[PDB]
């Protein structure tokens, strides 16, 4: 699993610093 793969992922720390996510 991923921060921006599916299923995304962008509310834990470690995914938000992501252009994906901020």
Same mark, same amino acid.
């Given at each position: *699993? =991923? &921060?921006?793969? !599916? !299923? $995304?992922?962008? $509310? =834990?720390? %470690? &995914?938000? !610093? %992501? *252009?994906?996510?901020?």
């Amino acid at each position: *699993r =991923d &921060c921006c793969t !599916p !299923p $995304k992922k962008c $509310k =834990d720390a %470690q &995914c938000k !610093p %992501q *252009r994906c996510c901020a």
